Amino acid sequence: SPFEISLAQWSLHKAFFDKKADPMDFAKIAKEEFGINAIEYVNQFYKGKAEDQAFLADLKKRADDHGVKSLLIMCDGEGALGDADEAKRKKAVENHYKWVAAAKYLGCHSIRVNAQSGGSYDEQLARAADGLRRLTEFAATHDINVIVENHGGLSSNGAWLAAVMKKVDHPRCGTLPDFGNFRVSKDEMYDRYKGVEELMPFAKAVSAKSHDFDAAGNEIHTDYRKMMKIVASFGYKGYVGIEYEGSKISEADGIKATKKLLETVRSEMA
């Protein structure tokens, strides 16, 4: 009731890439291995399939059969939406159209894209705002949001990405705040609490990033109590997606630890 828990597919990326699990069973696996009934896909596990009507029908059916909600698709490898090269930015925008349609088909509310760009602060802001606005124009006709997750570079700068949002100036372009992605560069780690707070006014989804847990089951890098307080203070009551990216405990344990942490924190909320 304070919020709901979903699973983001990158939590299982090692299992899928090593062919120890079938991407098509993502809904089943979330539901049966982890007791989770909402998912966020990553397009890397379905390369070439976005316009395959039979594949979409199948993926939608497996979700329906297991009573799992499809929330959004995270899009990687389709180009930089703020590419300094004009022709490449245009191509990046168009590469996402198919994923917009796929998301609509599955009943997702958004696609998550990057704001990758090049040049100084204001050049990147103008370029990213341009690509995002152009893609959002297409997506809006499908009643689908375009949202950016902080993910390195200036996109990990909360104020820069918030300024990009303001420049894009479209209600269907928003953010997907990630708890942990705040390394702007080797020399700069942005304040994750300030950054999420800067991104929350635009949030359509939230990503509970985790890596490592202590003996009490608390995440070592991010204080989830403090973080969820920030999230809730903006009235966000939707799904919070587990995105386990640690290297010490297995993905299965990582997912379970994150779910358990989120549940504990949620029980303290009312």
Give me the DSSP letters along 84-119: SSHHHHHHHHHHTHHHHHHHHHHT-SEEEE---B-S
- How far apart CA 223 and CA 226 sit, in angstroms, is 5
DSSP-derived letter for residue 252 is H
Method: X-ray
CATH of the domain at 164: 3.20.20.150
Angle at which helices 97-106 and 86-95 cross, to 10°: 20
Q: How many domains does the structure of the chain reveal? A: 1
Q: What is the resolution in angstroms?
A: 2.3
Bridge partners, 69 (sequence order)? 38
Which residue range forms the structural domain that includes residue 208? Answer: 1-270
- How far apart CA 196 and CA 206 sit, in angstroms, is 9
Is residue 258 within 8 Å of residue 210, measured between CB atoms? yes
Is residue 147 within 8 Å of residue 183, measured between CB atoms? no
Pairing of strands 206-210, 188-189: unpaired
What is the spatial order of strands in the sheet that 173-176 belongs to? 173-176, 145-149, 110-113, 69-74, 38-42, 4-8, 239-244, 206-210
CB burial string 202-233: b at 16+ within 10 A, e below: bbbbbbbbbbebeeeebbeebebeebbebbbe
